[PDB]
Amino acid sequence: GSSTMGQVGRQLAIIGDDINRRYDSEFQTMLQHLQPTAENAYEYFTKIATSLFESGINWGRVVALLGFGYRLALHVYQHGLT
Amino acid sequence: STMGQVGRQLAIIGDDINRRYDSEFQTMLQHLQPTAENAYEYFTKIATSLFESGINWGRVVALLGFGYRLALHVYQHG
């Protein structure tokens, strides 16, 4: 409800909607360029994570990798459905 | 292109997420006044209030990032 917990929850909804609208299109472009398959998806994800964390680590970088891994797995799943 | 470009682009995206919302996470934690005794209660009610208007991967990672910052706030203070 209108409690302080309900206030924070609705503020995270706006942050998450802003994260989704700012980077989902970029995730799809990066996945289209990588052309990942079920054979090299985990190999790609490990190489990307090491290149990512080579310049440091913060919670923003971790949630970006989590969101990209989810789009990665979703991309390999849907492009194999025949 | 290569995995290096994608990895470096996620570093840019991740650093962008960090600068845009960390202060907002800080401001919400100061108003919440979370302690070791109500942290999971707060997280659960916040998640409920968050997902009452839908769910996408952005909302999930935002809740995960805030829950990390929430636990770290209770751990380091209390």
From Swiss-Prot, chain A:
A motif (BH3) lies at residues 8-22. It is found in: Mitochondrion outer membrane. Expressed in a wide variety of tissues, with highest levels in the heart and skeletal muscle. Homodimer. Formation of the homodimer is zinc-dependent. Forms heterodimers with BCL2 and BCL2L1 isoform Bcl-X(L). Forms heterooligomers with BAX. Interacts with BCL2A1. Interacts with RTL10/BOP. Interacts with VDAC1. Interacts with GIMAP3/IAN4 and GIMAP5/IAN5. Belongs to the Bcl-2 family. Plays a role in the mitochondrial apoptotic process. Upon arrival of cell death signals, promotes mitochondrial outer membrane (MOM) permeabilization by oligomerizing to form pores within the MOM. This releases apoptogenic factors into the cytosol, including cytochrome c, promoting the activation of caspase 9 which in turn processes and activates the effector caspases. This is Bcl-2 homologous antagonist/killer. It comes from Homo sapiens. The gene is BAK1. The chain holds residues 68 to 148 of 211 of the full protein.
